Design a protein around this ligand. Structure first.
Ligand SMILES: *[C@@H]1O[C@H](CO)[C@@H](O)[C@H](O)[C@H]1NC(C)=O
Ligand code: NA
Lengths: 275, 7, 99
């Protein structure tokens, strides 16, 4: 449907030896296309998707300069955050932020995002209008007041409507075979007797893309929300994803349970019973 | 690949 | 914040004894990002373990995927062992071909 370019940035004050002071990974939808980091001030960049082989050398040369400047600015921000929060020196603190832009099926821009967190908690978020900010406390309220006085959201918008749109368009073009697809799940039910006479029914979904999915068990006349065990959707490592959901049921009543699967690649929810 | 100065 | 990792151990494809496959150790929901992950077969540390880049989710918690080549059998044991600063001690999770 719609397509998104996303970057996930992390800065660490006094990381461990050999660990990055700054790292960012970039995605189109659920496909990673690069890793950037800075260790002891040295920037490094690595491609991760096949379409990145088509980028010209200047792409990587400009990216390296961006990495150096971002890593120095994040380090400075972490130092000021320590002061405004009256925190002791020596400890290690974390600054994370996300950056994205989204286009619809016709490449029209639909939205964009900028949001930051400090030590794993929300700090500041850019609103849907792309012009105002939401803070969480009096420190982040200083940031908001400064960013609004200086009209900083204008330059984020220029980035969104400039490089973010440029890159999203070119990546989708060169990587169309990977990105413009929807692989539906392959589903089946597994049956495992338990030593007490009852039975585990495990509903599997494999090989689907994108990752968003839903699995649900249902009984004749009883809701199973609280009864069923779900695992977090997980990468198979080849581009696809997998998941399962399980319930314990008495032996002999297996055929009154049904597993429902919902996914983008399915025009209707799939239904499954044991055997 | 964009960063905003917090403080 | 000080979030504890959740761990799942599973094969890329549905396992079939004696068939080359990939074993995954998916670790999620932890913060800070520093973590140590090892994979073991029959008590021996596997040398060839590749790691994805670390990333993070909507709630800012981190996640990462470790994986290695393996051939399942009926007599071999596989585990993932994980240490994070939120844990007093390492936690080992064994592969179960049903999960
Ligand atoms: C830090 O101390 C200053 C006073 O210099 C105060 O205004 C501020 O609220 C304090 N912040 C915290 C997080 O204690
Ligand atoms: Na953070």
């Amino acid at each position: 449907g719609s397509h998104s370019l996303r970057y996930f940035h992390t800065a660490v004050s006094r990381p461990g030896r050999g660990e990055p002071q700054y790292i960012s990974v970039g995605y189109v939808d659920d496909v990673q296309f690069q890793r950037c980091d800075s260790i002891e001030e040295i920037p490094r960049m690595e491609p991760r998707a096949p379409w990145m082989e088509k980028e010209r050398p200047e792409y990587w040369k400009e990216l390296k300069l961006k990495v150096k400047n971002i890593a120095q600015s994040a380090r400075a921000n972490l130092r000021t955050l320590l002061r405004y929060y009256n925190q002791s020196e020596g400890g290690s603190h974390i600054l994370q932020w996300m950056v994205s832009c989204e286009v619809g099926p016709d490449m029209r821009l639909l939205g964009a995002h900028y949001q930051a967190a400090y030590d794993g908690s929300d700090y500041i978020t850019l609103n849907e209008d792309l012009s105002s900010w939401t803070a969480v406390d009096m420190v982040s309220q200083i940031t908001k007041s400064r960013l609004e006085s200086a009209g900083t959201a204008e330059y984020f918008r220029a980035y969104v409507e400039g490089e973010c749109l440029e890159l999203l368009h070119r990546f989708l073009r060169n990587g169309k075979e990977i990105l413009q697809r929807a692989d539906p799940p392959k589903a089946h039910v597994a049956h495992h007797p338990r030593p007490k006479g009852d039975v585990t029914l495990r509903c599997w979904a494999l090989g689907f893309y994108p990752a968003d999915i839903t699995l649900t068990w249902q009984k004749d006349e009883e809701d199973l929300t609280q009864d069923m065990e779900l695992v977090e959707t997980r990468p198979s490592g080849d581009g696809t994803f997998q998941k399962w959901a399980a319930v314990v049921v008495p032996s002999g009543e297996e055929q009154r349970y049904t597993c429902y699967v919902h996914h983008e690649g399915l025009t209707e929810p799939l239904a499954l019973k044991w055997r | 690949m964009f960063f905003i100065n917090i403080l | 914040i000080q979030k504890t990792p959740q761990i799942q151990v599973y094969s890329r494809h549905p396992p079939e004894n004696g068939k080359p496959n990939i074993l995954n150790c998916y670790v999620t929901q932890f913060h800070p990002p520093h973590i140590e992950i090892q994979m073991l077969k029959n008590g021996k540390k596997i040398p060839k373990v590749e790691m994805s880049d670390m990333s993070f989710s909507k709630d800012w918690s981190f996640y990462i995927l470790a994986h290695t080549e393996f051939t399942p059998t009926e007599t071999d044991t596989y585990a993932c062992r994980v240490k994070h600063d939120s844990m007093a001690e390492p936690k080992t999770v064994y592969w179960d071909r049903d999960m």
